[PDB]
Scaffold this active site. Structure first.
Site, PDB file in Angstrom:
ATOM      1  N   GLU A  58       0.818  -1.208   0.000  1.00 35.42           N
ATOM      2  CA  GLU A  58       0.000   0.000   0.000  1.00 35.42           C
ATOM      3  C   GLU A  58       0.855   1.263   0.000  1.00 35.42           C
ATOM      4  OE1 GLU A  58      -2.805  -0.390   3.253  1.00 35.42           O
ATOM      5  OE2 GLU A  58      -2.223  -2.492   3.501  1.00 35.42           O
ATOM      6  N   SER A  59       1.868   1.322   0.862  1.00 34.11           N
ATOM      7  CA  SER A  59       2.762   2.478   0.940  1.00 34.11           C
ATOM      8  C   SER A  59       4.187   1.959   0.797  1.00 34.11           C
ATOM      9  CB  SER A  59       2.574   3.238   2.249  1.00 34.11           C
ATOM     10  OG  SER A  59       2.456   2.351   3.346  1.00 34.11           O
TER      11      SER A  59
END
Lengths: 198, 266, 156
Positions: A33-34
Site C-alpha cells: 500500500e505504501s
C-alpha cells in the site's frame, strides 16, 4: 519487484510490532500500500484510530492480530479482511472464500492475496496459487508477476537548478574620524577656544 | 584560485557590460532597491537602523569601482559622496537624517525660498570662511544648519552654530590681489601631517610654499593666481584653464614635511 | 578590399537608413549609453577616467559624419561641440566637469536666477570683449566662471 534483503526503518519497527502476528507479513502488508500502513480511508482512521510510524504500524499490527486471530489458522483470510472490511462488502466474499469459490470474491481481494501469499501461510494457499491457471493443472499468474518489467522511467529528477548571489566585496570605508574640535580636546586637554586665548 | 579581490574586477566587468534588464543588473538592482528603501525609511522614522546591509554593500562596491556605481545608479553615488564628506568631519549620519526630513516636508516653492534665504544669510557674514564657501562645503554646511534648525526651533542659533563649526575646522587660503581675498577653502583636518590636529598648521606652510612654487614656475596663467579645492582626500591647486592640476593628499604632505624636517639639522 | 575609410561611408549609410529599433541603431546605442553613463559618472565623482572608450569612439564617429551623430543622438552632439570649443582654447575637460557639478546641484528656479545674475554681471563690464559676447563664447565663458566659482568660493 520486492525482496526481504533491503532493511530500513520499516524492518526496524515491525520487529516489535509483530511481537505486540508476523514480521514477514506486516513488512509486506505495508509495502504493497505504501512503498517502504497507508490507512487511506477517512473512516479507517476514525475507526482504527495518522502519518506517524509509531502508531501506523501499531494500528496494522493490532488489526492483523485479530484478523489472523479470528480464525488462528487462516492468514490469507486475515490479509483479505484487512483491505476488505467485514461490513456490507466483505461478508459476501469471506463466506465465499472458505468454500473455495475464488471466482466470486473480488477483483481486488484476489489481486491482494495473490501478491502476499508468497510470504503468508494458509491452508488455501496452494488452492488459490493455482486458482486460474490456463489449464487446470496450471498456475494463474498474478498481476505483478506478469506485468513485471512493463514500466516507463520518470524523466524529471528532483535535482534543482542553482542560482548564486552577486556577492562582490570591495574595500571597506574608514569610520567617521573624530571632529577636529574633539580631536584637539583629547590630544591637548583643552578646547579650541581655550587655546586661542593665549 | 584567483585573488579574492580580483573576482570583483570581473563580476563588475560583467555588470558594466550588461543590458539594462539583464539578469546581472537585475540581481544587483535588489541591493539598490533595498538600500533606497532603507534610506527612505531612515528619513521618515528618524533613526538609522543598526542593521543596514544593503547600503553598506553598495558602499563597498562603490569603493571598489566608483565610476561604475556613479554611472549605473546616480543617486546612491551622491548619497555616498555626501556621507564621505561628512565622515571626514566627524558628523554622525544623523545630521543628514535630521536635515532631509525638514527638506522633504516642503513644497517645491518653499525650497527655492529657503535656499535663497540661506544663500543670503550666508553672503552677509563677515568671516570669509562663511561668506565665500565652495559648493561642496555649502552642502555640508546646509546640512548642519538644517539639523540645528530642525531640532531647536531657532532659525538663528543654527547660523551661529554652523558658522562656529566651519570656523574651528576650516581655513581660507589667500594670495595676491584677488577680489574678495579668498582662493579656496580647505578643512583643517585634511592638512595635518601628524596625528595631533595642531599639526595642521605645519601642513599649511607646505601648501603656501607649493602654491607660490607653482606660480614661480607657471607664470603664463591669466593672473599669476591659482585656485584651491579639496574633494575627498586630496587638495587640487588647479589653474583657471585646468592645465596645471597639482594634487596633494595627507600622505604626500606628510612625506614633504618629513623631508623638510630632514633639512633643518643641516 | 575597399579603403578602410570607405567602410564607414557604408556602415553609416545603413545606420542612417534604419528604423529606431533595428539591430543597427541598437548595437550603436550601446556606445551612446556607455558614453552617457561615463559622462554622468564623471560629473558626479569629479575625475574623468583615463580610460573612456565609448566617448572617444562616439567622437570619432561624429568627426566622420557630424550631421548624422547630431541628428540621431542630439545630446552627445552638444557635448562634443562644447568639448571642441574648449579644446580650441587649451581648457582641459576638467572645467566642464567642475562647472556641471555646480549646475546639477541646483533647482530649476535657481538656474534662472543664476543665469540672470551672470548675464547682468556681464553686461556691466566695460570692455566690449565681455559686455557683448556671442552665445558660443558666453557658454565657453560661463564654464570658466563656474569652474572658478566652484573651486574657490569667490563669486567675484
Amino acid at each position: 519487484y520486492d525482496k526481504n534483503v533491503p532493511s530500513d526503518y520499516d524492518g526496524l519497527f515491525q520487529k516489535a510490532a509483530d511481537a505486540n502476528v508476523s514480521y514477514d507479513l506486516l513488512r509486506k502488508v505495508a509495502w504493497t500500500e505504501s512503498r517502504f500502513m497507508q490507512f487511506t480511508k477517512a473512516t479507517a482512521k476514525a475507526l482504527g484510530l495518522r502519518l506517524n510510524p509509531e502508531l501506523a504500524i501499531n494500528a496494522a499490527a493490532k488489526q492483523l492480530a485479530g484478523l489472523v486471530g479470528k480464525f488462528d489458522g487462516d492468514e490469507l483470510k486475515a490479509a483479505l479482511a484487512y483491505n476488505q472490511g467485514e461490513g456490507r462488502l466483505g461478508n459476501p466474499q469471506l463466506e465465499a472464500y472458505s468454500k473455495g469459490d475464488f471466482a466470486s470474491i473480488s477483483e481486488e481481494g484476489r489481486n491482494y492475496m495473490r501478491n502476499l501469499l508468497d510470504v503468508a501461510k494458509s491452508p488455501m494457499a496452494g488452492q488459490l496459487e493455482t486458482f486460474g491457471g490456463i489449464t487446470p493443472k496450471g498456475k494463474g499468474i498474478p498481476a505483478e508477476v506478469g506485468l513485471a518489467g512493463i514500466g516507463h522511467k520518470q524523466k524529471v529528477t528532483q535535482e534543482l537548478p542553482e542560482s548564486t548571489s552577486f556577492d562582490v566585496k570591495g574595500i571597506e570605508q574608514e569610520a567617521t574620524a573624530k571632529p577636529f574640535a574633539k580631536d584637539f580636546w583629547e590630544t591637548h586637554g583643552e578646547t579650541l577656544d581655550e587655546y586661542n586665548s593665549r | 584560485d584567483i585573488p579574492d579581490g580580483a573576482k570583483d574586477a570581473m563580476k563588475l566587468k560583467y555588470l558594466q557590460a550588461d543590458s539594462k534588464d539583464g539578469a546581472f543588473r537585475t540581481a544587483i538592482g535588489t541591493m539598490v532597491t533595498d538600500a533606497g528603501q532603507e534610506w527612505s525609511a531612515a528619513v521618515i522614522n528618524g533613526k538609522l537602523p543598526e542593521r543596514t546591509p544593503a547600503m553598506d554593500a553598495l558602499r563597498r562596491i562603490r569603493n571598489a569601482d566608483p565610476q561604475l556605481i556613479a554611472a549605473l545608479y546616480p543617486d546612491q553615488a551622491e548619497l555616498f559622496l555626501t556621507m564621505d564628506m561628512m565622515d571626514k568631519q566627524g558628523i554622525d549620519p544623523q545630521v543628514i537624517l535630521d536635515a532631509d526630513r525638514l527638506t522633504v516636508k516642503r513644497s517645491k516653492e518653499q525650497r527655492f525660498e529657503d535656499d535663497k534665504a540661506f544663500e543670503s544669510a550666508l553672503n552677509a557674514s563677515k568671516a570669509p570662511e562663511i561668506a565665500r564657501m565652495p559648493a561642496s562645503l555649502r552642502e555640508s554646511a546646509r546640512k548642519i544648519y538644517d539639523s540645528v534648525k530642525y531640532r531647536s526651533g531657532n532659525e538663528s542659533m543654527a547660523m551661529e552654530q554652523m558658522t562656529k563649526f566651519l570656523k574651528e575646522s576650516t581655513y581660507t587660503f589667500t594670495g595676491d590681489d584677488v577680489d574678495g581675498d579668498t582662493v579656496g577653502v580647505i578643512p583643517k583636518n585634511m592638512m595635518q601631517v601628524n596625528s595631533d590636529p595642531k599639526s595642521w598648521e605645519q601642513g599649511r606652510d607646505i601648501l603656501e610654499e607649493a602654491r607660490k612654487g607653482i606660480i614661480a614656475s607657471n607664470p603664463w596663467i591669466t593672473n599669476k593666481q591659482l585656485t584651491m579645492y579639496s574633494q575627498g582626500d586630496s587638495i587640487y591647486l588647479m589653474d583657471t584653464t585646468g592645465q596645471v592640476r597639482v594634487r596633494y593628499d595627507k600622505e604626500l604632505l606628510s612625506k614633504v614635511w618629513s623631508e623638510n624636517q630632514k633639512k633643518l639639522e643641516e
